[model samples]
Target: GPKFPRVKNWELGSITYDTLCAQSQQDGPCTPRRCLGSLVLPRKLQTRPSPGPPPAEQLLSQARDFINQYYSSIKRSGSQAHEERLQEVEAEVASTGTYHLRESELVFGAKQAWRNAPRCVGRIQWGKLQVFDARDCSSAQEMFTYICNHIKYATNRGNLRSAITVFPQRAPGRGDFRIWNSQLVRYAGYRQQDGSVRGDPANVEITELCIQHGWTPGNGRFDVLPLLLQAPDEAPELFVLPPELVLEVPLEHPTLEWFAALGLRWYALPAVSNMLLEIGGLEFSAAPFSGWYMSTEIGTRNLCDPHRYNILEDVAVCMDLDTRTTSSLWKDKAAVEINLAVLHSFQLAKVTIVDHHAATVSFMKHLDNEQKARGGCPADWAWIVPPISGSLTPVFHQEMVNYILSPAFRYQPDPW
Candidate 1:
C-alpha cells in the first residue's frame, strides 16, 4: 500500500520553527489550500521558549568539567559560566522537540588529546564536550578566541542575498581544490581535458545526473564499498548539509564493477528530482581536523561488535534542500516543494510509513484471506482426498489434502 498523508523517515530541524500555517477565518474566508503560500496562523506549533534550554555544547562541557575537576587537575576558568549556560540550554531544548538530543548522543564535540606524548602518540580525545566547561580553560579559551577572531557577521548592504556560514565539509579553503575527494571515489570519472582518471565533479549548476563521493581530485579506495552501519573513523560534521556525498553511475565510468554488483543505494545531495539511480554506491566523508565524521567510534570499540554500536541513532545526511543554492532543486521559485531526507523503503510505494493503522489492517486482512483460500498444514497439505471406500475398505486412509482442509476449517473463523 502507498504511504501517503504522512511521509516519515525524516531535517537543521531548527532552533525555531512553526507547524504548517492554518486557514484564515477572515471576511473572505480562506481554505487550507489557499493558505499554502504563507503561514498566517500566528500560532507556532512550538518553539524553544525564550530563555530556552542551554545550547548542546553547554551540557556536555559541564559534565566533563565536573568529572575533570573531580578527577584530574582543573585548568579552566569558565566552569561556573559553562554550568549555568548548559543548564539553560537544556531547559530550552526540553521545551522544544530537540531535548532528546543528549550531549553524549550528539555527533559533534571537542577534541581531547591523549595523556602523554610519544607514548600514546596520534591518539585524540574526540568526545562530546561543553565549551564552557573545559578542563583546560586556557585551551578552550584559545579555541574560542580563534573562532572570535575569524568570525564575521556580514549584513546585506546591497540587493544580493548574503552568503552563509562556513561548512568545512562542503566548502573549499583558500587555493584548495582537493575538496569532495570522497565523492570522486564513489562516482569515479576522469579529467575532461587530460583524460586523467578522477571522479565527476559537481562544480557547475545543472540538474546533475551524477553522484557525489568525495571532495578532492582522488578519493579513498574503499569509497565504493557498502556502508558499514558501524561507527565511523571520526565524528560527523554538524549543522552542514552535503557534509560528504556520493552519486551512483555506470560501471564503465571507472568505478569497480565488483562493488557495483551489490544492490546498494546512492544519493544526489541538492538534486534528487530524479530517482537516485544505479546499484553503484559512493561515500563523501570528511578528513581529520575537519571536525567529526564518525564521533561515536571510540567508545564503540572501533565499531567491531555490531550489537554494541548505535549506528541508527548516530548517523545523518546533510543535503542542502534550500532551492536558492546553485545546485539546489529550488533553483526556480516555481518549484515550491522541497525533497525531504525521508526514507525510501524496500517496497517503493511504501516509501515512508511502516506501521500506519490503515496499512496494517489491510495487510493483515490480505494475509488472513490468502491463508484461508490456499489449503495449508505445511507438513500434510499435499494430495489430500476425501474418504471413498466401503465399511471394511483397506483404502480408508485419507490424504494430505483432507488433513489440510480439516485444520483450515478449525483455524478459520468463517469457513466461507
Candidate 2:
C-alpha cells in the first residue's frame, strides 16, 4: 500500500506497480467517495482548442520537450542535429507565434499519440500506422480528396490498414478546418414521423446536418451519410463518397441462414473524423484516422447499444429464444451469436477483423511491451474490456491507471 498504484491481476495472482501514474499531472474523476473510471466517455465537456495559440513560453517548452522526445526516439539525443533542431524550433516561435513539426516528426507524433491512446484495445498496432500529411490542404474540396485517398488506402480491398491524415493546424485569427461527421463511414439514421429512427440512432444529427447541407436523403436503413467538410470561415460542404470507395460487408451467420435474410451490413473502415489531433503544442483540427474493426465493436456495442442500432431484441426474436425473462440469458446467447456472425461475415468476405479473444490477448502483450518499454501504460478499464464478456478477458483482471499523455488525439466540440 505504500507504493504507487500497485496494479494487480487477480485472475493470475500477478502484480505490477505502475510508476507512470506518479508522473500523472491532471486530476481524474476519481475521488474518495466514488471512482468514475466506469464511465465510457470522460465527460461531455470540451477538449476544445484554446481561443488563441498558447503563449510562446508554454508552446516553446512543449516544443522543446517533443523535440527531445523525437531525437531520443531515434538514438540522436544530445547530438548536434538535435540541438540545432531545438534552435530552429525556438527561432520559428520567436519570429512567428508558433512552430511546426517536420514530416518525419509528424510521423513520430502520430504513432506516439496512438501508442498513448488509453481507450484503444488495438494499441499493439500503433507502430504500423501509415501517416498522411494534408497540412497543405486549403479547401473543403481538398479535404474531401484527402479523405477519399485515406479511405481507399485504409480499406485496401478489405485488408484494412490503420491510417491517419493530418490536415492544417489551428492558427490564431483563422477558423479551424473541421470534419462535421463523427466518422468517415457511418450509416445515416432518419428520424421517422412516428418518433423512431430508421437507421443508426447515433447518427441522427449528422444525417440531419447532411440533408440541411443540401445532400439528398436516402431512406434505406444502411444509407451511408455524406461528408460535411468545413474549410476555414465557410459553411461545411457536402461530399458523397463514391460507391466503390466505400467498402461494405453484408453480415451473415455461419450456421443461421435466416441471419442473412435480415440484411445487416457495416462499412469496412472505422475512421474517426472529428477528433482533434494534438502533437507537441500544435493542434490539427481536421485529422482523421481509421483502423480495422474488433468484431465486438460492431456486433456487441454498435448493434446492441440501445442508443444506437438496438437490435438485440430483434435478433433474439429471430432466433426464437424465450423473451419472457432475463433469467433465460437470451441477451447473452443472442449477443454471442451476433458477434460470431460478425466474425464469420468479415472472414467470409476476406475482410480484416479481430475477435475479442485475440484482441484482448494481443492487448495483454501490448501491456507487457509498454511495461518493459515505458514504466507504465495509461488504460481505461471500462473501454479496454469488451462489452460481451468482461471477466473472460485478461484486462478485466488487471487494474489500470488512466492519464493523458502528450501527442494525443482529443475530442473537440462539433462544428455546426
Candidate 3:
C-alpha cells in the first residue's frame, strides 16, 4: 500500500480548511468566534468533490485496437500514420509529469485514485458547443492515456523510477479525480445555428455526435476508428523498394513544419476547428510555399445550391493567408470547401473534422454572397451572411478513437 504524495504540509485538522462557501474543512460544520459584532461568517466546509467522468463503454475498450486502426487507416491512407500515432500519443503524454494511468501502457505512477469517481464540473456555454460524452469520451481517454503513459515512462527508459510509485497514496482526498480537461471546453458536433435545426451545423452536429458515440453506418465507427489501430503499425516492417516496388507507399506529410516549430500556427486556424483529412489518392503536386490555402467548390447541385460546390482537394487549409483574395475570403472558402467536401463525402456518416480551428470556426457564419464571388482568402477575414445552410462538415481524426476511449472521454475501474 505504498503511495502518498502532494499533501503539501497539511494543517487545520480540528476542521477549518474552508474553500469559500463551496465549503471543505474536511466536511464538518463550525461557526465559533465573531458571530455578529464584527461579522466573520465562514465555517461551512466540504472539500472532496471533483471526480465524475470515465465510462463510455470502459473507455472504448481501452482504445479498441487504437480506434479500429485509426478509422481504416485514414480512409485507406492519406497517411500521417494516424497523426503520427497521435503524436506518439501526445509525446507519451507530456512525459507524465503528473501521476497518470488511463490503462497503463506505463506512463509514470498514479493509478489508484480514479476508482468510483465522477463529479467534475467547469461549466461552459460561449457559442454553446459540447459533444464528446461517451462519459466525456472517458475523461478524454484518461487524458490521452495519461499522455501516452508519460511518453512511455520518461525518456523511454521503461519502468520509470518505479513508475512514480503508483500515485494515489493520499493527496486527492477531496473525492479525488480532479483535473477535468476536455481541452477545458470547446467541442463540436454542431448546434448554435437555429433555422429550427433542419440539417447542417456541421452535418447535423456531426451526425448527432456520431450517433451518440456508437458511430453509425452499421456502427463500430469505421472499424473502431480506421481499422484496428492500423493493422499493427501498417504491417510490412521492412523490405527496400524493389520486389516490384509498391511495398509500402503511403505518406501524406505535413505537421506544418512540426506545427510551425511548436508555435502551433494558431493550431491550424480557419475556425470551425478540428480537421486532418489525409483521405487518399493524395495530391498537392506543389503549391503551398506560403501559409497555405486551397479548398473551394461551387458549381452547384442544390443541397440548397446557388452554385455547385466541391473544393478541398486533398487538404492544405491553415488560412488567413491575409484572406486570400478576400470577397469575404472567397466567401468563407466556398462554404468550408464545399461543405467539408460534402460532409466527408456525403453527410457525416463516419466523421472527420481534424481540428483546423474546428475547421474554421465551425464554418465561419456559413458564407455565401453568391459564394462571395469566387476569390480566395487572406484579407478582410472574409464575408459571411445568411447563406451557409449547413456550413460544411467533416471532422473525423478517426473520432479520436471514439473520443479517447470514452467514459464520457477515460480512466475508470470501479464496478463497485
Candidate 4:
C-alpha cells in the first residue's frame, strides 16, 4: 500500500496494491503531472519511433532473463539444462551478434506475449494459443502460404482458436518482413465525392495503397482487401485471398426481421497483421496473430465509433427513434439492439463469440488468477472495458494499473 499503486473495485469494495507494477522498468506516459490512461493509444504511438538496433549487452541480459524465466517455468531454474542453455545463447551472440530461440522457447514466448497484453479482454485463453514458426520463410509466396495455413487452422470451420504466425526476425541487414494490411481481413473504404467514406473509414489508407499497387477496387460495403506481403527490401506483392479461405458471418437479428435488410456482415477472423512481436529482445518483424472477436467489437466499436463506420445515427433512424433529442436515449436504445443483434447473429451461425457480460466476468477471473500467479495483473482500463455499457460492466468499477511487460506485441510505423 505504501510503495505501489493500490487497485480497487468500487462495486465489490475490495482492494489490492499491485507489487508487480514495480517490476515494469519502462514507465508509461503517465506520471504525477496527469494520467492519460483512458486514451486508446499512448501519446508516443501516433508515430511510434521505429525500433532501433540495441547493443549486444542489452540483448545478452534480456536473453538471459528470458532464458531464466523459461527454465523457472519448467521447475529447472538452477539446473544443468538452464546453465548450459545460457552458455549456448551467450556463445551464439558472441559469434553472430544475435541468438536464436529454440522452438519450445519460441512457443512459450508467444503465449507469454498474449498473456502479458494488458489491453486484451481474452487473456484467459492465452495458454491455448498455437504458434507457427515460419522463421525460415524467404519470400512473399511462402509468407502468404503460411498465413493461409494459419487462417485455415485458426478458423477451423467457425470454431476460432488463438494463433500467431511468426516470420523472420529483424537484423542489421535489409528491411522487414511486412504485411501491409492492418488486419488479414478488412473492408475497403472509398473516398466519396462529398468527402464522406463509403465503406469502413479505418481502412482508407491501406485501401488506397492496395489500389496503387494494382488491386482493382470493389464496389461493396465489405470487400476483403488483398494481402501485400513483403519479404524484405523487395516490393510487396498483391495476392488476393481465396474467397473460401475468408470466413464471414452474415448478421441478422433473431427478433428484428428487418435487420438482415441492412446488408451487414463481418469477417470471422480478426488477425492483427502489422504488430511487431518482441520476445527476449528478438524482434519478429511480421508476427500476425488472430483470435475470435467479442460481440461489442463488431456491434459497438466497429459499427458505431465515429471514425470507423459511424452507423449509430443510421441505425437509430431506421428504428424510427427520435433523432432530434439527446434526452430521448434513442442512441442507447439503438445501440443495445445492435449489440444484441450481433450476439444473436454470431450464435445463429455457430461462430465463437463472447458477449460483454460474460467477457467481463471471465476477465475478472483472469485478473484474480494472474494476481495470485504474478502478484498483479497489468491492464489498460480503457481498452479492457467494453465500448458500450461502461459503468454497467464490473471492469468499469475496477481501478487498474497499466504498464509494459516483455515478450510484447508492439505497434510499428506503416510500411508505406
Regions of candidate 4 where Cα sits further than 4 Å from its true position: 43-52
**Model 3 TM-score on a 0 to 1 scale:** 0.16
State the lDDT of candidate 1 residue by residue for 119-163, as single tens digits: 111112212212222112122223233222221211111111111
Instruction: Give the total clashing residue pairs for model 1.
Output: 46
Candidate 2 stretches with Cα past 4 Å from truth are: 1-3, 31-34, 43-45
lDDT tens digits, residues 1-416, model 4?
Answer: 36878889999999888888876655577878998786666754332434565678988998998898899888899899999999999999998888999999999999998998899999999999999999999999999999999999999999999999999998766688999899999999998889998889999999999999999999788988998999888999999999999989998888888889998999899999998888887888799999999999999999988898888898899899998999989899889999998889888888889999999999999999998988898899889989899888999999998998877887877887
Clashing pairs counted in every model: 46, 0, 106, 0
Ten-residue region with minimum lDDT total, candidate 4? 44-53
- What is each predicted model's overall lDDT from 0 to 1? 0.22, 0.90, 0.22, 0.89
| Candidate 1 weakest ten by summed lDDT | 406-415
Task: Write down the TM-score of every candidate.
Answer: 0.18, 0.96, 0.16, 0.97
> Which parts of model 1 are misplaced by more than 4 Å?
1-79, 97-108, 113-416
Mark the regions of model 3 whose C-alpha exceeds 4 Å error after superposition: 1-325, 328-337, 344-416
